[PDB]
Design a protein around this ligand. Structure first.
Ligand SMILES: O=C(O)c1cc(-c2ccccn2)n[nH]1
Length: 145
């Protein structure tokens, strides 16, 4: 199985599923290197975030446990087609790239912080990540090219 795609056991149904320990993606169907990849993301900062500040709120106060909740929340809406990445990203993302529907433009290694990189490279064109933790906050990372 591709980079970090491991199989495992669903603790609700006991039926097969896959999680990726590099992007924290989890999906039921079996899964499927670039020099550069292009990604958009939705960032939800927290108190412990690098710069607890964003175009949305001058001092972020939400805890980490809560940041995650919010992040899980959008994943459900994205996964269920209730909302798309771009809409939630253009509204909620605590990064200024929200103005650009969360695009961060094309990029290669060394360039971004490592957990974001490792996720960004391990996704394939189309995959969204699960929650990804960096010193900045919590990300949902979609890979576009
Ligand atoms: O604070 C911000 O504005 C911010 C930081 C990031 C970021 C992007 C990639 C990896 C790590 N952090 N994205 N947005």
């Amino acid at each position: 199985l591709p980079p970090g795609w491991e199989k495992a056991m669903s603790r609700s149904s006991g039926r097969v599923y896959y999680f990726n320990h590099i992007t924290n993606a989890s999906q039921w169907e079996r899964p499927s290197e670039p020099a550069r990849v292009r990604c958009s993301h939705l960032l939800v900062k927290h108190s412990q975030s690098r710069r607890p500040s964003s175009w949305r709120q001058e001092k972020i106060t939400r805890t980490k446990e809560e940041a995650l909740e919010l992040i899980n929340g959008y994943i459900q809406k994205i996964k269920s087609g209730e909302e798309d990445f771009e809409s939630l990203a253009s509204q909620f993302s605590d990064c200024s790239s929200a103005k650009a529907r969360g695009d961060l433009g094309a990029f290669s290694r060394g360039q971004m912080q490592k957990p974001f990189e490792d996720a960004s490279f391990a996704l394939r064109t189309g995959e969204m990540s699960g929650p990804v933790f960096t010193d900045s906050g919590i990300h949902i990372i979609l890979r576009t090219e």
